[PDB]
Amino acid sequence: GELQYLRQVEHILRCGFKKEDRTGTGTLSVFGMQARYSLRDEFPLLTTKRVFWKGVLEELLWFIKGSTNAKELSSKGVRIWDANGSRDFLDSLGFSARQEGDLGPVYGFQWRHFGAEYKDMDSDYSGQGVDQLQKVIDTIKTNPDDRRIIMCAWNPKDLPLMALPPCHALCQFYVVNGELSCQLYQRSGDMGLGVPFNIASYALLTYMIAHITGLQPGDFVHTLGDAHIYLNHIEPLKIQLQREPRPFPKLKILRKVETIDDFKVEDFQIEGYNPHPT
């Protein structure tokens, strides 16, 4: 399973093109890649380098409750978003009137309130917009054959208000033989840092919705747009390709949860996770 992520890193090193980027540092880049990670009795937390699993779980819980407030997640000891909610960064984009921590209408707003008129991170959006997360869950229960089970965070109208455009433009869910699968469209992926994390996020989400829907986790299909490696991270990765992968951990949910909103941190345990050091 992890071989696919390794083979993808190798491919970019062996066939990617040099491509400048917004940061001016430069990458090796391939456009268009796809990998399928089984979720059947294992969880694809990568072993050839440690993934910040606390961040994955708490960020997803943050997403689910609809929050666009970087402080709400920082208080969990996960600071991924803090720099994009900083005062100077928000002023850098003309959001002087904004409060620090207000990320705009990012994933939380889009997943729970798509199409609603955003104001600030403290506003009350109850009943406003499309609750895509719950629509997906209802459709899985009532019509698992549906080929439109999509959750879309890419919102062209809200893009100017987001602190940064979402990398995870949309995901699609699928059911056959009582198995729940998920395909992520990730428009831009840093193989050295973001991507192993993002694989965890959406595999976790698939586990959660399969639990709520009475289904088994199936496959997680990861589809990349610009899949890249920053030039200054080539040497760490070449070392990492050398390290042989140890079997994927497993994920256990310690109690029968009924709604996606009822999940909490202590309902999840990663057992068997032996990553290589870095």
Add this chain to the structure above:
Amino acid sequence: HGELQYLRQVEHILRCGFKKEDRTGTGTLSVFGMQARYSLRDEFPLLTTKRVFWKGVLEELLWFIKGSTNAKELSSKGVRIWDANGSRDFLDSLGFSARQEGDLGPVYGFQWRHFGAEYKDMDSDYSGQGVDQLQKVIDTIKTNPDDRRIIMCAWNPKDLPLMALPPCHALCQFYVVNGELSCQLYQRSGDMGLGVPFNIASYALLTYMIAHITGLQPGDFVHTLGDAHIYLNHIEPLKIQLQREPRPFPKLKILRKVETIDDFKVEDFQIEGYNPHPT
């Protein structure tokens, strides 16, 4: 040959797909998640193991580009693909009895050109309303080709109930390197035996058109599928089609220097050397 990828995908579905049902109850063999890369360098991926309705491809795309959501405006060009979904009965079944025949709702033409504006009807004037995604994409390719956010999104959860059909082509993304423009389509649902060859041609063409406008060379079309399926009653014709050897892809020529995307006309295009197997 790039058509071999399509053929291997068809074969993979017949050998490993799962017999899953669908909304029409007809029954399919289905695989969730596939990807193919069709080179666009000095050839056009118009499939040869079965003829593709190229006229339909060109006219539909031109219809999409000028923002239309009236099925009759495409029908009047000889392309009847959308007519059934704008019929009187079909519109009345969805709850659109106050809509004129042919009013498909905020489908692709509206989303590409006016994303976020309030849909009234097909004859409304939407000038300046919503996000012009198609032109934003063209602009970004020119001013900042390294950008990793060049996306055109037709999936609009707010507008979905207003549409005659939910779009199969949720979004596409463009990419520039080495003076070459590539395109990835996320297609949520794909009939391998009818729509898919057509869909591959649609977005390859769109890539040719936007490359022309931005002074770039077509690179790759990357085709990504969610539910890739074959209908049970089409298994036998496809398995005969799989033993046919593909002929070289035709070439597409653009017969004139065009400045803006709105300025393309049907006569600007010529498919040369298209020799598909008969049926």
